């Protein structure tokens, strides 16, 4: 039950923070493709986006850090 297949997105955006936030943990970790049911191709992209965000301090690497 993938979101990105239905939406039909060409590429996942690191700037689209809200969307990312659904796929990240309360502890900051990226959520598995088993749980979200994201398609494999998209999942990787999502992960990459998240990573990018983390570099730009848009998303946090973890809950504890400060």
């Amino acid at each position: 039950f993938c979101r990105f297949t239905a939406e039909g997105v060409q590429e996942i955006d690191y700037k689209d923070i809200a969307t990312l936030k659904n796929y990240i943990t309360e502890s900051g970790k990226i959520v598995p493709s088993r749980i979200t049911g994201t398609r494999a191709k998209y999942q990787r992209q999502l992960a990459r986006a998240i990573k990018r965000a983390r570099y730009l301090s848009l998303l946090p690497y973890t809950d504890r850090h400060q």
Binding site: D16, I17, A18, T19, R52, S57, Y61
Partner: protein, 104 residues
């Protein structure tokens, strides 16, 4: 030539200097017959974690179709400039002119 996408983060005390910097950056791009497809001052923004001890910073997005030499130059400038904390020049396939989801 090659469609880059740049996002740089300025120190929040230098927020009034930002426009000038942006202008300068644009100018350089223009110089080598480089187009600038979108440009979005995101403004002051709360950081997810405190980079270099400070909690807010001033984000500027900028999409550019420029030659790589100029990109390199820009990068160099960023690295030496102390106002800009982070940058992230990042290649892209197309021009991507439509606005960002956080501006909208």
């Amino acid at each position: 030539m090659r469609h880059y996408e740049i996002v740089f983060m300025v120190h929040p005390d230098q927020s009034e200097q930002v426009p000038g910097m942006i202008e300068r950056y644009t100018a350089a791009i223009t110089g080598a017959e480089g187009k600038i497809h979108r440009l979005e001052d995101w403004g002051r923004r709360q950081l997810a974690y405190p980079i270099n001890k400070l909690h807010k910073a001033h984000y500027v997005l900028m999409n550019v179709e420029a030659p790589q030499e100029v990109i390199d130059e820009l990068e160099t400038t960023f690295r030496f400039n102390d106002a800009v904390i982070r940058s992230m020049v990042m290649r892209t396939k197309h021009a991507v002119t439509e606005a960002s989801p956080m501006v909208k």
